[PDB]
Amino acid sequence: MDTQRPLDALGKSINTNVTVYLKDGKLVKGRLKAYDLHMNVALENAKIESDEEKEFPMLVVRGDNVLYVSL
Amino acid sequence: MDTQRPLDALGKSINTNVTVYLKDGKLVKGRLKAYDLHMNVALENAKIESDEEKEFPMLVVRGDNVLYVSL
Amino acid sequence: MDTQRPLDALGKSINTNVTVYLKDGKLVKGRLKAYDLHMNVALENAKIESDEEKEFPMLVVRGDNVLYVSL
Amino acid sequence: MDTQRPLDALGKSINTNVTVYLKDGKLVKGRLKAYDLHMNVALENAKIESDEEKEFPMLVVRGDNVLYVSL
Amino acid sequence: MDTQRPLDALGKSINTNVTVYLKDGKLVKGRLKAYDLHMNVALENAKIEKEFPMLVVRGDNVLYVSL
Amino acid sequence: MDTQRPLDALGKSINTNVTVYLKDGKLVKGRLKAYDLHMNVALENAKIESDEEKEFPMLVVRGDNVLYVSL
Amino acid sequence: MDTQRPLDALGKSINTNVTVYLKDGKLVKGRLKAYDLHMNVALENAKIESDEEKEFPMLVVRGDNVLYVSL
Position E8, amino acid: D
Q: Nearest Cβ partner of E9 from G22, G28, G58? A: G58
3+ Cβ–Cβ pairs closer than 8 Å linking E and G: yes
How was this model experimentally determined? X-ray
Grouping H, G, I as helix, E, B as strand and the rest as coil, residue A31 is strand
C7 Cβ contact partners less than 8 Å away, ≥ 6 residues apart: C35, C37, C39, E36, E40, E56
Q: Are B40 and B61 in contact (CB under 8 A)?
A: yes
Per-position DSSP letters for D10-51, written without gaps between them: HHTTTTSEEEEEETTS-EEEEEEEEE-TT--EEEEEEEETTT
List of long-range contacts for G22-25, beta carbons under 8 Å, 24+ apart:
G22/E63, G22/G61, G22/G65, G22/G66, G22/G67, G23/F24, G23/F65, G23/G65, G23/G66, G23/G67, G24/E23, G24/E63, G24/G65, G25/G50
Is D55 annotated as contributing to ligand binding?
Answer: yes
Taking the CA of residue E2 and the nearest CA in chain G, the distance in Å comes to 7
One CATH from 2.160.10.10, 2.30.30.100, 3.40.50.150, 3.40.50.10140 for A1-71: 2.30.30.100
Q: How far apart are the first and last CA of chain F?
A: 14
Query: Cα separation of B55 and B32, whole Å?
Result: 14
Chain F, nearest residue to D14 by Cα: F3
Q: How far apart are the first and last CA of chain C?
A: 13
CA torsion B49→D67→A62→D60, rounded to 10°?
-160
Q: Do F6 and D33 touch (CB under 8 A)?
A: yes
Burial class (CB in 10 A: 0-12, 13-18, 19+), C29: middle
- Reduce the secondary structure of chain F to three states and give it as a string: CCCCCCCHHHHCCCCCEEEEEECCCCEEEEEEEEECCCCCEEEEEEEECCCCCCEEEEEEECHHHEEEEEC
Q: Are C69 and E55 in contact (CB under 8 A)?
A: yes
Which sequence spans correspond to the domains of chain F? 1-71
Residue pairs spanning E and G at CB distance below 8 A? 61
Q: Does G7 touch chain F (CB under 8 A)?
A: yes
CATH 2.120.10.80 fits E1-67, yes or no: no
C18 Cβ contact partners less than 8 Å away, ≥ 6 residues apart: C10, C29, C30, C31, C32, C41, C43, C69, C70, C71
PDB resolution in Å? 2.5
Element containing residue B11 per DSSP (H, E): helix B8-11
Q: Nearest Cβ partner of F71 from D11, D57, D64? A: D57
Q: Nearest Cβ partner of E64 from G14, G35, G60? A: G60
**Closest of C25, C4, C15, C5 to residue C68, by C-alpha:** C25
Query: Cα separation of A60 and G13, whole Å?
Result: 43
Q: Are G20 and G28 in contact (CB under 8 A)?
A: yes
Chain E, nearest residue to G44 by Cα: E67
| Residue in D37, D68, D69, D70 to test binding to A, most A beta-carbons within 10 Å | D68
Residue pairs spanning A and B at CB distance below 8 A? 62
Q: How far apart are the first and last CA of chain G?
A: 12
Q: Do E60 and C63 touch (CB under 8 A)?
A: no
Is A64 annotated as contributing to ligand binding?
Answer: yes
Query: Cα separation of D14 and A60, whole Å?
Result: 14
CB atoms within 10 A of CB A45: 13
Q: Do A58 and D9 touch (CB under 8 A)?
A: yes
Instruction: Assign residue A8 a region (left: φ > 0; alpha: ψ between -120 and 50; beta: otherwise).
Output: alpha
Q: Nearest Cβ partner of D34 from F6, F39, F71? A: F6
